[PDB]
Amino acid sequence: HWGYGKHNGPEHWHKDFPIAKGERQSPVDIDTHTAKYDPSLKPLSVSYDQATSLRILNNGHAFNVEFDDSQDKAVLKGGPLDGTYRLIQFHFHWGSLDGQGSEHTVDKKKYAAELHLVHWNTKYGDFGKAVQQPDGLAVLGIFLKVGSAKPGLQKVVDVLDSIKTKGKSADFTNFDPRGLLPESLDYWTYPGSLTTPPLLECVTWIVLKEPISVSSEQVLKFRKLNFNGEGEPEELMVDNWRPAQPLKNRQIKASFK
Ligand SMILES: Cc1cc(C)n(O)c(=S)c1
Ligand SMILES: [Zn+2]
């Protein structure tokens, strides 16, 4: 099955998931000089005051922080979106070294990691029906750079030793995702896809311009997770990022001058 190694990595995925070579794949490089300011975009509205986290899960590819999405509690709207998108989970992509790890790049620059806050369009009723639609998802992508610690990240780092291997989960209640947000909500936006199989083309990407800073110690703890399950040879969970894909017939729009 798919993964991030030599024999099952991103260059292989197209054989089980042919949409890997589709017309709106993600991530992409954001060429800041070519991204046009769109004064018709709206400020993004991120309303996370009532977010209910439930659990954290090592799925063998990354970890997911999962939310109760059975009511309008943590929603994204505004920006490029029509209507209301409900937070279902967040996860990260990261490198073995600080110079790589993000999926989107900015003028070919890679950040150490990238956070994805995944939301589904409530007009489709649930996540499974939303990923069958071209406007079913909105993913808020936030870059991580190594520097000062992010205090709001520490509760996630401190639980990782409890979900070291594939299939492990832990209670993860009362986590507030507002502590993962940078000051500015200035963003780039373009139509794309999930960056992991099944690579579905459902995503309005909203990529914040401002990275958050995390400490070297925090990212080191991500790199101690394992892709393997308990009792299997150890394979560290690092470099779980897909490289940039062809932009094709798409334009990236900027919310800011
Ligand atoms: C819904 C979803 C799930 C995963 C694992 N990833 O990586 C993205 S970008 C989106
Ligand atoms: Zn992702």
Side-chain angles (χ1 to χ4, degrees):
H1 246 330
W2 73 270
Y4 294 94
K6 184 164 259 144
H7 303 276
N8 67 0
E11 300 311 313
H12 292 276
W13 295 350
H14 73 97
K15 288 173 280 171
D16 277 329
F17 304 96
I19 201 176
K21 291 184 192 287
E23 297 305 307
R24 56 177 282 187
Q25 289 288 293
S26 294
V28 299
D29 181 49
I30 297 166
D31 195 74
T32 64
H33 282 117
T34 284
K36 194 182 181 189
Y37 168 59
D38 185 348
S40 81
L41 287 168
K42 303 178 186 81
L44 197 59
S45 172
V46 178
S47 296
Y48 291 168
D49 41 285
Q50 296 301 130
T52 302
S53 59
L54 292 184
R55 191 168 81 131
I56 186 171
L57 168 75
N58 177 331
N59 64 18
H61 308 289
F63 64 86
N64 293 341
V65 172
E66 291 154 0
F67 287 79
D68 175 11
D69 67 348
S70 64
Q71 306 179 253
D72 270 331
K73 270 174 181 185
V75 302
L76 181 72
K77 65 194 246 277
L81 309 166
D82 287 335
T84 292
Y85 290 67
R86 200 174 287 177
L87 179 64
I88 177 167
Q89 58 107 304
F90 72 74
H91 61 278
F92 300 81
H93 306 270
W94 63 88
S96 54
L97 302 164
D98 301 347
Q100 64 192 49
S102 64
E103 291 204 311
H104 294 92
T105 57
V106 176
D107 299 329
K108 306 290 173 97
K109 170 195 171 80
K110 296 172 163 102
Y111 287 89
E114 184 173 325
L115 160 73
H116 287 169
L117 296 126
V118 178
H119 312 73
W120 54 265
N121 194 326
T122 61
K123 84 187 230 163
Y124 298 123
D126 68 12
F127 175 86
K129 170 70 42 161
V131 306
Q132 299 177 49
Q133 317 305 149
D135 58 348
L137 297 186
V139 183
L140 179 64
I142 299 180
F143 296 119
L144 283 62
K145 66 177 189 194
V146 175
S148 296
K150 194 64 170 167
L153 184 64
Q154 190 62 34
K155 286 202 267 178
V156 173
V157 165
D158 282 329
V159 90
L160 302 179
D161 71 287
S162 78
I163 56 145
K164 186 172 187 203
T165 47
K166 180 180 195 193
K168 295 217 169 278
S169 77
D171 298 324
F172 199 67
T173 48
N174 303 102
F175 179 76
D176 188 341
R178 292 179 295 190
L180 301 180
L181 306 175
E183 291 177 357
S184 185
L185 292 182
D186 286 341
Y187 62 88
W188 293 285
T189 181
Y190 75 98
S193 71
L194 310 183
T195 63
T196 40
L199 303 171
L200 298 169
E201 295 179 339
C202 321
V203 183
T204 295
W205 277 95
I206 299 168
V207 179
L208 298 189
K209 173 183 161 188
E210 184 182 327
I212 54 166
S213 283
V214 301
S215 67
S216 189
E217 296 87 359
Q218 286 177 319
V219 70
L220 285 161
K221 293 184 183 178
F222 283 28
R223 300 180 184 133
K224 293 178 117 105
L225 288 167
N226 277 192
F227 287 127
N228 56 281
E230 191 182 2
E232 280 162 22
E234 182 173 40
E235 181 83 55
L236 288 182
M237 180 179 283
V238 294
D239 298 313
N240 50 1
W241 53 274
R242 189 187 192 194
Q245 302 299 307
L247 189 66
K248 304 201 165 159
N249 188 213
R250 298 174 286 178
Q251 291 198 140
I252 303 179
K253 297 180 195 152
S255 81
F256 56 93
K257 289 206 201 99

